[PDB]
């Protein structure tokens, strides 16, 4: 087995990805060619891609093909391709393996211009759109917006041309549900690639200064339950301290991190003082607990503290607050885990171990002593204990590190690591146990690497050097090892590393090119032929690479300043190693200050890009196959190994005053200069930008531009003021001068506010470096948006401070709901394609609180469609068994009418093209001849007998009436003859209790008929059967006495079905009742009984059917019992179809489609007819629910408002504000399917 190959490939193919497949062969000397091909699965017919590769000593018999799966070449449709054949073909070998494929190709980074938005805002939003290759994807993208209730609100589409998809601004609806909204992004047609972002909608006003609350520990232990100590600091959004603030502390019990509201204490509620930006506080938790808790001891509290702080600037008007719920009281507060450790051993090589200590609510503790105890085995299970070892954790990294000089012959190690903090006993000093295992070569053939796991990221463009040491009984054979460098899903470098005459091998001396960032994985492998049997030997290591951009893009203000003045014109420079696009945006730091723990949207970009990597762990493996699988590869080889041993386990180890502006995109032709004016606001603006090119993304460093002023006035205006009340609004002048000066304030306002202060002042002086309270008891008269201004005049200065006050009405913002289902076909009953909604006015409307009206619309989708259809045997079902005696003619033509009806689904006449068409004119002929035949079976009195002189039968009359209901589209029977038939039936055989007892024929017919009941309530069958036929004829002979006979028959059949007669009678009765009052309470009870009697397969039912009468006996051929089964199931089907219960029907259709009990029923005309009727009805129902509904909505006297093209592809248009005070009329074109339309009204009462 000297001649051997390895083909190595990603564990999973990404659709549309360019995948690099590498091949090595051994024991060959004649140069030869191979082809590596990606082929359809299982049939291998279509070839997606193919690569010819040539192998020779000129290539050291190594090569690669670049192969790709362009997404349109897949068949697509509802069933996407799960699997594809990878193939290799040569003169010497042919093999193929079933690769999995994935449609997850690339990255959709949603960036919203803020994380928080008020109502009455539009979001700016854009999406960065990148391939798996990290190039700008240039693909159509779609956004979907979900409210905090999980209700879809809007969808919008845009076409990428750049990698930067600047979607239209989303106007927040006129009445949003407050809370966490979500944006999802998808490539429209052909990828999963689902991006996500979150944003919060709330009534808020920007904080005027940050409060930062800084406990010394996220946990309280024995050392700090006696006394816990905490720092608080406060700083403006210009980076200067709060000079003085009054502080009120609050403490409380807590029992959950997630969601509890346990009681606050009423002790240590310390009113205290913050100076020079800082307050220092201490809580004696022991005494507070013992005083006011029911707890008295820490051992009762593996639980949490709540802490909150509020503060008010001691010489001003602004106030702020925050909290830190969840400081963990815990007896064992630490936890431990590995980081970057393999758990695989190279013997004799110093084996490194690293551990991270973490907390509950984990941070890097960094300060813990830890110690290690270990036991080993080398050979024949000689259990050998190691000497213990000790490290501190690193204070910054958290890492405690160890290295074990294990025996040169060690086979396994298992060990414990425990916290050695002398203050914690081992019941408290957190501890863990772990096992590592050797590579388990059969050939004792190994390939170790001289890698210490250098903790420090490799810098881009350095040469990595790794010496590599195969060790083997057969090293003389091992001419070269082969190496692969993989990044993310993809092999990016491959090569060969020759043995020197030193009996050692060329190291991997390679540049870490930019494509390797942030992480790459090195796998080295060889095949050694052994004595006769080949073995693939491999090892791999994760290589951490410096995070660096390919563009090296940099951005800076060219007129650099520590702080700029408001409105200052500035110049900005963008410089790059190559021509690039760049997006820019600016956002105020108070915005992020709004939300505790807010995230910068371009955070984690590299760690998110790393989620693309298919591997897990830091390297190594229990085996060659395990090494490749953990490396994220798979391989085809004859060298006695296969990756089918392993599976994709969930491996998860650890390794003007705007809010926003400058929201733009620009080209930078290697360099660009911009000139622009700053806003009038005072803050740190954070200016952030993202470079994009065919070289990929870069995120630039955030330029924090300060805008500042030494003397100014500010006002703590709340988000809205309730109309008609007066409130003392508070604020303060600030002096950051060395000296005090006199100031004066002369507030002015639009007449929408008139207030008794009537803003010659006190002309107070602020002290130097101090603030002075300013207050106004403004009393708003008029609702809405009103300009208020705080003009100020002062010694050596003036200031202007325009504002818009929002005034909101008194009372309660109550909401009310109304809506309907649009049903332009009457699937549920009354055709309902118009509705009207007057502008109704509540009797408790407050006189000025004009009612807000909002519209919403939903499409209702078909769901699962099960393509149950006839075989080509429809030819036979038409050409049916020879016409003749026993009314073989009747039994032949009776299916013809129903096959006709079935094809009058239309599809099957529109398309038979898999097979030669049924000739439509042949069908029409056959139908006509059928009508001619069926006339021959009418009795003179319009009863029916199969024999011309035979006994008249109500049974056959009802059958005829059913048939004659169908035919009328081509051949109506004269209504008089139908009326005569019905009249004769009802007038002779209506009865006082039960009905339609068969008149004069006790002799059954087998293939035309079906099993009667036992005499007990056998009338149920007759009543049901006759009812069915009558209802199918009733639309062509309405007669009030017949209606009365229906009502009677239904009453009797119901009253006789209440005792749950044997299930066939129940099923046929339920089918009869589904023709009647579909909402009759007892009908619905009988349906519930039918549903309880169903049989199913699978917990979610895949198949559903009914058995009775020991039909669980075997039947390999159709028979009376299989007939009973097929008919009773077809009746349950038709019942549920009349309830339109598609979701319940589906597993019935599937079970029918199987034809289990093969051949069907007894091949009666009954079972076959009723089955094909049910299948026809289903086929109809699917097209009925198919959504196409062009809604139009207009006011009554005022004009049209809006139109919705509600369609399967666009099933949900945005909600619309119903602005105008007129009656609203909504309607639709006839179209198809179902919708629901709502209007809701908000009124302040």
């Amino acid at each position: 087995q000297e001649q051997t190959y390895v083909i190595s490939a990603p564990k999973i193919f990404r659709v549309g990805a360019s995948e690099n497949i590498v091949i090595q062969v051994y024991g060959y000397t004649e140069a030869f060619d191979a082809t590596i091909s990606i082929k359809s699965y299982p049939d291998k017919k279509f070839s997606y891609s193919s690569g010819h590769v040539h192998l020779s000593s000129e290539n050291k018999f190594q090569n690669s093909a670049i192969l790709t799966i362009q997404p349109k070449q897949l068949p697509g449709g509802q069933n996407p391709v799960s699997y594809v054949y990878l193939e290799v073909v040569s003169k010497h070998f042919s093999k193929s393996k079933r690769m999995p494929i994935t449609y997850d190709n690339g990255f959709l980074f949603i960036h919203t211009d803020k994380p928080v938005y008020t109502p009455d805002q539009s979001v700016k939003v854009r999406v960065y759109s990148l391939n798996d290759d990290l190039k700008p994807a240039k693909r159509e993208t779609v956004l979907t917006f979900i409210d905090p209730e999980g209700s879809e609100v809007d969808m919008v589409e845009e076409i990428d041309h750049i990698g930067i998809i600047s979607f239209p601004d989303f106007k927040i609806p006129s009445n949003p549900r407050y809370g966490m909204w979500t944006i999802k992004a998808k490539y429209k047609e052909d990828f999963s690639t689902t991006g996500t972002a979150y944003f919060e909608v709330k009534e808020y006003v920007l904080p005027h200064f940050s409060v930062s609350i800084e406990p010394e520990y996220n946990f309280i232990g024995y050392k700090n339950f006696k006394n816990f100590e905490i720092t608080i600091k406060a700083r403006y959004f210009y980076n200067k301290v709060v000079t003085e603030a009054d502080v009120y502390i609050t403490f409380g019990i807590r029992e959950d991190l997630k969601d509890d509201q346990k009681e606050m204490m009423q002790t240590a509620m310390q009113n205290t003082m913050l100076i020079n930006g800082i307050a220092q506080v201490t809580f004696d938790s022991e005494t507070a607990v013992k005083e006011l808790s029911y707890y008295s001891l820490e051992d009762l509290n593996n639980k949490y503290l709540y802490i909150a702080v509020t503060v008010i600037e001691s010489t001003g008007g602004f106030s702020e607050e925050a909290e830190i719920p969840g400081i963990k009281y815990v007896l064992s507060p630490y936890k431990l885990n590995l980081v970057a450790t393999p758990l695989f051993l190279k013997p004799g090589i110093p084996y490194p171990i690293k551990v991270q200590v973490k907390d509950s609510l984990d941070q890097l503790v960094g300060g813990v002593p830890v110690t290690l105890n270990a036991q080993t085995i080398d050979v024949n299970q000689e259990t050998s204990d190691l000497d213990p070892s000790k490290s501190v954790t690193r204070v910054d990294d958290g890492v405690a590190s160890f290295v074990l000089n294990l025996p040169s012959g060690v086979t396994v190690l298992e060990f414990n690591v425990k916290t050695d903090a002398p203050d914690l006993p081992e019941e408290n000093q957190a501890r863990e146990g772990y096992r590592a295992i050797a590579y388990s070569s059969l050939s004792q053939s190994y390939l170790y690497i001289d890698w210490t796991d250098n903790h420090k990221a490799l810098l881009v463009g350095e040469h990595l050097n790794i010496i590599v040491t195969p060790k083997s009984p057969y090293i003389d054979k091992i001419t070269h090892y082969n190496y692969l460098i993989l990044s993310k899903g993809k092999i990016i470098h491959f090569g060969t590393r020759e043995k020197f005459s030193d009996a050692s091998y060329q190291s991997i001396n390679i540049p870490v090119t930019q494509n390797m960032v942030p992480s790459s994985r090195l796998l080295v492998y060889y095949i050694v032929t052994g004595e006769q049997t080949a073995e693939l030997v491999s090892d791999s290591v994760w290589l951490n690479i410096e995070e660096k951009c390919g563009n090296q893009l940099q951005v800076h203000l060219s007129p650099d300043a520590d702080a700029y003045s408001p409105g200052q014109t500035v110049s900005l420079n963008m410089a790059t190693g190559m021509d690039s696009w760049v997006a820019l945006a600016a956002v105020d730091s108070a915005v992020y200050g709004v939300q505790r723990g807010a995230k910068k949207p371009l955070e984690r970009v590299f760690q998110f890009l790393e989620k693309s990597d298919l591997g897990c762990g830091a390297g190594g493996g229990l085996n060659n196959a395990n090494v490749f699988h953990l490396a994220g590869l798979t391989f085809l080889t004859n060298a006695n190994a296969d990756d089918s041993q392993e599976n994709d386990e969930p491996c998860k180890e650890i390794l003007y005053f705007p809010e926003s502006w400058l929201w733009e995109v620009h080209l930078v032709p290697r360099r660009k200069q911009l000139q622009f004016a700053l806003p009038d606001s005072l803050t740190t603006w954070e200016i952030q930008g993202v470079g994009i090119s065919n070289t990929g993304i870069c995120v630039a460093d955030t330029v924090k531009a300060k805008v500042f002023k030494d003397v100014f006035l500010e006002m703590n205006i709340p988000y809205s003021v309730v109309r008609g009340e007066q409130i003392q609004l508070k604020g303060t002048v600030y002096n950051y001068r060395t000296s005090g000066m006199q100031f004066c304030v002369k507030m002015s306002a639009v007449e929408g506010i008139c207030t008794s202060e009537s803003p010659k002042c006190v002309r107070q002086k602020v002290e130097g470096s101090s603030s002075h309270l300013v207050t106004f008891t403004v009393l708003p008269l008029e609702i809405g948006l009103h300009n208020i201004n705080f003009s100020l005049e002062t010694w050596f200065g003036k200031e202007i401070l325009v504002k818009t006050l929002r005034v909101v009405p008194e009372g309660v913002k109550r909401e009310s709901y109304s809506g309907v289902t649009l049903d332009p076909r009457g699937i549920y009953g009354t055709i309902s394609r118009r509705k009207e909604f007057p502008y109704r006015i509540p009797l408790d409307l407050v006189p000025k609180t004009e009612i807000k009206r909002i519209l919403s619309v939903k499409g209702l989708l078909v769901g699962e469609i099960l393509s149950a259809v006839l075989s080509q045997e429809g030819i036979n079902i038409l050409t049916h068994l020879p016409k003749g005696s026993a009314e073989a003619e009747l039994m032949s033509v009776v299916p013809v009418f129903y096959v006709f009806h079935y094809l009058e689904t239309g599809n099957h006449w529109n398309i038979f093209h898999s097979d030669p068409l049924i000739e439509k004119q042949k069908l029409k002929k056959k139908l006509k001849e059928g009508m001619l035949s069926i006339m021959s079976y009418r009795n003179a009195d319009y009863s029916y007998s199969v024999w011309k002189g035979g006994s008249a039968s109500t049974w056959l009359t009802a059958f005829a009436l059913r048939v004659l209901g169908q035919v009328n589209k081509y051949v109506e029977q004269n209504q008089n003859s139908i009326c005569n038939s019905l009249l004769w039936l009802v007038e002779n055989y209506q009865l006082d209790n039960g009905s339609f007892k068969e008149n004069s024929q006790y002799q059954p017919i087998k293939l035309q008929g079906t099993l009667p009941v036992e005499a007990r309530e056998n009338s149920l069958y007759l009543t049901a059967f006759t009812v069915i036929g009558i209802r199918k004829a009733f639309d062509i002979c309405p007669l009030v006495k017949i209606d009365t006979a229906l009502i009677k028959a239904d009453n009797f059949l119901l009253e006789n079905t209440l005792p749950a007669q044997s299930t066939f009678t129940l099923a046929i009765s339920a089918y009869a009742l589904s023709l009647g009052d579909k909402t009759h309470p007892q009908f619905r009870s009988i349906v519930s009984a039918l549903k309880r009697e169903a049989l199913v397969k699978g917990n979610p039912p895949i198949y559903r059917f009914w058995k009775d009468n020991l039909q669980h006996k075997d039947s390999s051929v159709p028979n009376t019992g299989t007939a009973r089964m097929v008919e009773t199931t077809a009746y349950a089907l038709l019942t549920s179809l009349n309830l339109k219960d598609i979701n319940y029907v589906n597993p019935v259709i599937k079970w029918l489609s199987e034809e289990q009990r093969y051949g069907g029923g007894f091949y009666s005309t009954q079972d076959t007819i009723n089955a094909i009727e049910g299948l026809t009805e289903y086929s109809l129902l699917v097209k009925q629910l198919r959504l196409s509904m062009d809604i139009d909505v207009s006011y009554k006297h005022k004009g049209a408002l809006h139109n919705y093209k509600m369609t399967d592809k666009n099933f949900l248009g945005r909600p619309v504000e119903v602005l105008l005070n007129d009656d609203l009329i909504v309607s639709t074109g006839f179209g198809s399917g179902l919708a629901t339309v709502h209007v809701t009204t908000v009124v302040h009462k």
């Binding site: 041309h161 750049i162 080209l667």
Partner: peptide
């Protein structure tokens, strides 16, 4: 210009005294 590159800003304005809706640039 006969065409406007994406993200570059045009300017459109009518003569004095006319009233005009919509933005001064379209993208």
């Amino acid at each position: 210009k006969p065409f406007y590159t994406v993200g570059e800003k045009v300017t459109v304005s009518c003569s004095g005294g006319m009233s005009l809706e919509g933005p001064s640039a379209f993208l």
